[PDB]
């Protein structure tokens, strides 16, 4: 049964099993129970077919014999649509189980007691510094006083911006099933388990696996953006909402342990969450002003609902009858004006007596939270509400105030100790999540603002903004930014795009400012791009204009950014507007699509240095907002070192980073990982501003510059100049099929990365590194040693290589070869072959530079997790390849096996969507 | 710090410490943290005074030097009222902490693997049979088939009737604090605890101890009976509500393990809870018809609220989209008639779509549960409601039905496994708690019914029921039980007592029958007593009359019970009415007040035998309802053997027992104990009907009869015939003071037991055993051996002695001597001395019969718990003794120490109430 499955799994991953290494055991137990379920639901025959696919794939992952892929292919292409769907569902579900098991292993893996002190320790969760160890290094090694460390942390802000799962927003219900599977699993391994508890936990585990597997409706319609946002907010309930105060309490403990005798102030804004879900409309016209309004109200509804749903518990605890005057007076006020009758609440449904004074205060907070929640709900569903302003909270201060009053009163009556329990936790939740637990960024591309302004200029009869030079655009924008009359009259002609863009500003002017964060400009190139958005916000008389944040994407745009920023910072109107602060966004995957990932990485390092210097010179504080695709978006320990690798002064007390949708599950799904994620963000941010990495040696810059010219040239000659690259890309990847659910340049970065990730080839991540390495080594043999010294000694270089190496570990060029054979026409097959030759050569240079014989010999726990997933992913790759063939070629047919599954009109496109989601869930983050 | 406190505590309890024995450690850690809290809240000086009281008391418990009591007395009588109150609060709170620690030790104490098979194993929680071991003994040793065991359990009923805490109903808020203290404590001892988790748990433990200590308002007013009922219902939320389905699932596992391949049916009524809170008005005119109406509505409100508060969770899980026709049709019905708009619920606030069919069904159940709850709330607060019948549940079947529909649909779609998760748990909760989680018994005394009937007869002009003989009463009652016209006209004259009794019947006629259980007749003596209540219920045309249950209290009443029952069962009207079933109540403490506990125990054994035989002869099924004071009301393992000790056929598939208010905390406060309580009730009930204890040898009956004559004579000559016993009782105990917040015969059993428990003397439990033993041994030396054989071999005798021995272990005649010296006049001090001499002699005979050198050498874990509590209780006894002196003698004064406590007009009676509650919480159950 179990032992035999353990046996097969163990062959896949040799390693040195101590007591805390249970990952293979976990996976065996889950696969075993899932196979019983499949047999039950679908029959022994189907179960055996799954087992056979698994076996062939595991054998292929052993020796990589192409024959095993062919057999696997023969089996899978012989299945009818019904059986295909069951098999893709099965293998997708096994990937999710394996991920949950891995999360449990990471959570309980033992910490290394004596850390070597090298920066490399910060790349691995077993060795990284926790917040206290970070405090102690800063005190003992950098000679900071405890007070200086405390004071910097109090002024620090970490902002985490959640973006949508590129493929599969996981619904709340299923998430909760996944959590209970993970728990049953952990409890099965609890010390001293009685046999009956074990028997019952076992049957509970079986049941939860099945419930999750059978949560599988294939819903005709794409998910609406409102549903995608709500799905994307599920992690707050599952872990983050409680996780924040647990981490802030660990900060209190750590402070205490370095001799600071106060708690971290409950209202220091150390942690802030934001979102792009319903705010980013770049290249996405489904994101309408109505969508943006709805996700603001949803965020407000959920936030007030989360406070409301925990206030009764706090009321129960706050039974104390000793209070100070201030609160006594307020309680007697509320008590006198108090309703004689039933409130339809679970717990305190009769009038609260005045000898329960804290309950009287908190009872009023509950009524306000309830009304705040209901208003938002009526605004969403009915389009408005008769609930008035003084019945709800419109600012966070109104909510904090009575809580602070409870706190002071307890402190004044001798009960400080009690105040620092749930009350303190609640205060911290209010201060972190406010009235909208995420602030929403708006994003739209620069050309849309140009178009809007052009419609205005031409209607005014003064010419065409689009025809104007950069100087003229600046001049006219600054004149109108101090203009005395509005720009927009009621008969301005508006195309649908122009209207859609203006109406977004209208929503911004109408909704409360605490709903919003930054206004990000995609494809920004110039000063005027930023002033353009400033003028539209001024025209709509927005009381608190959103800060305007350019996103410079292409290499050329990155090179022009410094002069653009310098010109902004020189303009009095703008300096006055921004009040000493500017945020700029970089997009790793964006820049990498333009120039190759190697050159984007190096150019982004340089551009950040240059912008930081320009900000200093102008006395402006700069925040760099990290978009997706960087070493800082990996999650887990690698994020810790990535943060510490940043160029000096680029953090300076304020971190803003994207948490990519495909990473959210690993970062925040399990509560220990959620805690350790918050911790490494806060610790690294703190450390970096007081302990910058080494700046590179001049020889290293020069070689980096030389390598970038070559990397870019290789990347661009393959991707942009080879006239048949596009055609090869459309055949070898599922790119076209993903898109229906101006070349690569007008293809967006997520489909670019995603399409090549699906085939296990990952061209967007590594292409260009090979030529860079080879050219450097061949120009001068000494460069091999220089590169190895950079890997060992230069944190930027180290993390940049490690991310590529992880992506190689998820790669398998045999999958791409099978796709070439099935999908690509014969005359392009040599092209596909030469790319595979570049992959191999590039991987081998990287290995040589890293000093590794094998992929990830640095990080065997990460390699182990990747290897355990591989057979499942491989089965899905093969299923997908033959599915694409059938879909593309209505005359491709094979003899079909009699239907295998029992029960007791889905098509090919349904099977495809299942493979694509499962493969993406197994690959998680790459480029 | 901790070690030194461990040292002092350890001296008090020598024993053989293995790894699972942490009780002393727990108590040290709690006392240590509490002392820091006292120092904080009240100053070092006060802390030191507490410590000093503790030390003196612990020393006195060591060697029992009277000098240590005097010093303790000198210290405590020198304190002012303020400091007294703090000290009594402190020692009360320490008792509660010690009890929580003890509960944790019992929960985690290791089970003995190889049980010796002797019945004595069933007296101890480490050795008792769990439900599977009970199944296996019945199969393997009594040759029952698995099917016969399954079938008997399916037809079995266990009913547990909750009665009010005689002294201190613990409020929900404080209960929850106690639970969190207990948890912090358990988690502090979790294997592999990180130091920061330990530091944080520590600070959490400190905080919860303090929060509990500061939940201490001294509220002028007695608690209203409605508040006492609500306090008394808190255990359902804390543990029982979840505990029931956890135990029923263990039954499923156990069945499976003996080869039965189905679950225990979800609707078999195996477990039922009932209540006397707001139903018992015997000797209590504060229990009015309005009180009874309110506690019915409260029970209905809470029950529907508990289902409502867990239905959203079940809705979340029940995301499945596969359903059968039956449920599909019902879902589309509900969906079509569905409200377009906001429901003010935490989770599913928009309209539920029809592709979530289980949520549609459960959404309707939620709305009904909500309306059912709101109706009850308006009926309580406003006096009526416009909410109509078809908007709520009026019968349990209406609630079960949609749940059963969900269950069948899952089973039919292949998801039986999922159905047997939370859905099954929910079905079982509905089937066990129904629409009123407790059914309420009414109790009133026979004379009140005589009085009501007398008012009727005289108003009718036909004479005086009270003047009528038993024969005439029977005759007239049977005639009117078939009468053709009502008895009660609108001008019937009614005193307040008569009206109060008639109006109770009116409430019974108006409220739903599922609110009520039995109508218990206190002080029942005759056939006519039972027919009297039957006639009043018929007069009020009650659609489902409550079953009428006599409580025969005195020895003479017990002796007349058989002829009374025989006459009832002979009467056609009555036989027809009861439909093959009769319940009779016995009251151990009641009978023991009349005749001494020894003779009551033996007489109750005989009367139960005799009633069982008479029931058989008449083809009636008999339930014996166990009132308080018996070996079956002990709780813990001793209850298991007590149940098995019952005379043969007195259970016969239906157990009904009182869970005494002072036992509820131990039985149901901690979740493991709650589970093991439900388990031993169900296991013992099952076993007994198939495995009766040995019936006694004739020589044993005869000696028991002889011993009873002597025991009764000694008990009655002290308690009733000594003309100064009453006067001595009023001085030596706090009986009078308890009562203000016809002799002993008209004193109620709870004040009798409670008053003597307070002084640690416990006369009501042991008096009479001494003469019985001595006379038996002196009449014939062989009787010592016969008695020892009875102890070893006869379960009744064994359990009856064990309960007395436990009470001796809680006794300390030195406390009674101090009370004599402080409170009793000089001329009665020899009387008090001679009682102490009887105590000693009685204890020593008991020890000799049990074969013990020391008290409780049988049960060292129980002795350990009692000893650890003793110093706290002793401090309270002394504080109380001097308090009573001050209260009784306005010219008793002592030099008072300058006020010791800090802060940053309570009197003597407040200090007294604190001592009385703390002493009762430390003593728990005795007689």
Swiss-Prot record, chains A, B:
Task: Report the subcellular localization.
Answer: Cytoplasm
Q: Does the keyword Cytoplasm apply?
A: yes
Q: How is its activity regulated?
A: 5 fold activation by the allosteric regulator glucose-6-phosphate. Low sensitivity to inhibition by L-malate and L-aspartate. Up-regulated by light-reversible phosphorylation.
Keywords, sorted A to Z: Allosteric enzyme, Carbon dioxide fixation, Cytoplasm, Lyase, Magnesium, Phosphoprotein, Photosynthesis
Q: What is the effect of changing residue 748 to G?
A: Loss of catalytic activity
Name a GO CC annotation attached to this entry: chloroplast
Q: What is the effect of changing residue 755 to A?
A: Alteration of C4-specific kinetics, but no effect on L-malate tolerance
Q: Please describe what this protein does.
A: Forms oxaloacetate through the carboxylation of phosphoenolpyruvate (PEP). Catalyzes the first step of C4 photosynthesis.
What name does UniProt use for this protein? C4 phosphoenolpyruvate carboxylase
Quick one: which gene encodes this?
PPCA
């Amino acid at each position: 049964k179990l032992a035999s499955i353990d046996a097969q799994l163990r062959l896949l991953v040799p390693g040195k099993v101590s007591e805390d290494d249970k990952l293979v055991e976990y996976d065996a137990l889950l696969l075993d129970k899932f196979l019983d379920i499949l047999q039950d639901l679908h029959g022994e025959d189907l179960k055996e077919a799954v087992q056979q696919c698994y076996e062939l794939s595991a054998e292929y992952e052993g020796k990589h014999d192409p024959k095993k892929l062919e057999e696997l292919g023969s089996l899978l292409t012989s299945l009818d649509t019904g059986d295909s769907i069951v098999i893709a569902k099965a293998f997708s579900h096994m990937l999710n189980l394996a991920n949950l098991a891995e999360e449990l292993q990471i959570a309980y893996r033992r910490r290394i007691k004596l850390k070597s002190g090298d920066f490399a320790d910060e790349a691995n969760a077993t060795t990284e510094s926790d917040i206290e160890e970070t405090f102690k290094r800063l005190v003992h090694k950098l000679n900071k006083s405890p007070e200086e460390v405390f004071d910097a942390l109090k002024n620090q802000t970490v902002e985490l911006v959640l973006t949508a799962h590129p493929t599969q927003s996981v619904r709340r219900s299923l998430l909760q099933k996944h959590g209970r599977i993970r728990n049953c699993l952990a409890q099965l391994y609890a010390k001293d388990i009685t046999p009956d508890d074990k028997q019952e936990l076992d049957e509970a585990l079986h049941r939860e696996i099945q419930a999750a597997f059978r949560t599988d409706e294939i819903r005709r319609t794409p998910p609406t953006p409102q549903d995608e946002m709500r799905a994307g907010m599920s992690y707050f309930h599952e872990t983050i909402w409680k996780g924040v105060p647990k981490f802030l309490r660990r900060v209190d403990t750590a402070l205490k342990n370095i001799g600071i005798n106060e708690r971290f102030p409950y209202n220091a804004p150390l942690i802030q969450f934001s979102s792009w879900m319903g705010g980013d409309r770049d290249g996405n016209p489904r994101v309408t002003p109505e969508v943006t309004r709805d996700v603001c109200l949803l965020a407000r509804m959920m936030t007030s609902n989360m406070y409301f749903s925990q206030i009764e518990d706090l009321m129960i605890e706050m039974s104390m009858w000793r209070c100070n005057s201030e609160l006594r007076v307020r309680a007697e006020e509320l008590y006198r004006t108090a309703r004689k009758d039933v409130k339809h609440y679970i717990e305190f449904w009769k009038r609260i007596p005045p000898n329960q004074p804290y309950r009287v205060i908190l009872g009023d907070v509950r009524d306000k939270l309830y009304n705040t929640r209901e208003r938002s709900r009526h605004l969403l569903v009915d389009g408005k509400s008769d609930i008035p302003d003084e019945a709800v909270y419109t600012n966070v201060e109104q909510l904090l105030e009575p809580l602070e009053l409870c706190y002071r009163s307890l402190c004044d009556c001798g009960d400080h100790v009690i105040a620092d329990g749930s009350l303190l936790d609640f205060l911290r939740q209010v201060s972190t999540f406010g009235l909208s637990l995420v602030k929403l960024d708006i994003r739209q591309e620069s050309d849309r603002h140009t178009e809007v302004l052009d419609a205005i200029t031409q209607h005014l009869g003064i010419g065409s903004y689009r025809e104007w030079s950069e100087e003229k655009r600046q001049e006219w924008l600054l004149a109108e930014l101090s203009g005395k009359r509005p720009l927009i009259g009621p008969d301005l002609p508006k195309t649908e795009e122009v209207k859609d863009c203006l109406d977004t500003f209208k929503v911004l002017a109408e909704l409360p400012s605490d709903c919003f964060g930054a206004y990000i400009i995609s494809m920004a190139t110039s000063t005027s791009d930023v002033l353009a958005v400033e003028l539209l916000q001024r025209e709509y008389h927005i009381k608190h204009p959103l800060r305007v944040v350019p996103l410079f994407e292409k290499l050329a745009d990155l090179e022009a950014a410094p002069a653009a920023m310098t010109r902004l910072f020189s303009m009095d109107w703008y300096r006055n507007r921004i009040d000493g602060k500017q945020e700029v966004m970089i997009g790793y995957s964006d820049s990498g699509k333009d120039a190759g990932r190697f050159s984007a990485a190096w150019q982004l390092y340089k551009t950040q240095e240059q912008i930081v210097k320009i900000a200093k010179e102008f006395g402006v504080k700069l925040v760099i907002f990290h978009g997706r695709g960087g070493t800082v978006g990996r999650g887990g320990g690698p994020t810790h070192l990535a943060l510490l690798s940043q160029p000096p002064d680029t953090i300076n007390g304020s971190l803003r980073v994207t948490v990519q949708g495909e990473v959210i599950e690993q970062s925040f799904g399990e509560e220990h990982l959620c805690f350790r994620t918050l911790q490494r963000f806060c610790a690294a941010t703190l450390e970096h501003g007081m302990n910058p990495p080494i700046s590179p040696r001049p020889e290293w810059r020069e070689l980096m510059d030389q390598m970038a010219v070559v990397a870019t040239e290789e990347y661009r000659s393959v991707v942009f100049k080879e006239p048949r690259f596009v055609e090869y890309f459309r055949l070898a990847t599922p790119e076209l099929e993903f898109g229906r659910k101006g070349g690569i340049e007008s293809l967006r970065a997520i489909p670019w990365i995603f399409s090549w990730t699906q085939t296990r080839f990952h061209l967007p991540v590594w292409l260009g590194f090979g030529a860079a390495f080879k050219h450097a080594i061949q120009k001068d043999s000494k460069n091999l040693q220089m590169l190895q010294e950079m890997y060992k000694t230069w944190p930027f270089f180290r993390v940049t290589i490690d991310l590529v190496e992880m992506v190689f570990a998820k790669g398998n060029p045999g999958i791409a070869a099978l796709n070439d054979k099935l999908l690509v026409s014969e005359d392009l097959r040599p092209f596909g072959e030469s790319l595979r030759a570049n992959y191999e050569e590039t991987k081998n240079y990287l290995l040589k530079i890293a000093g590794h014989k094998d992929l990830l010999e640095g990080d065997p726990y990460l390699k182990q997790g990747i290897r355990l997933r591989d057979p499942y992913i491989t089965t899905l790759n093969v299923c997908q390849a033959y599915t694409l063939k059938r879909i593309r070629d209505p005359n491709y047919h094979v003899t079909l096996r009699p239907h295998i599954s029992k029960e007791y009109a889905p098509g090919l496109e349904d099977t495809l969507i299942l493979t694509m989601k499962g493969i993406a869930a197994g690959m998680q983050n790459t480029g």
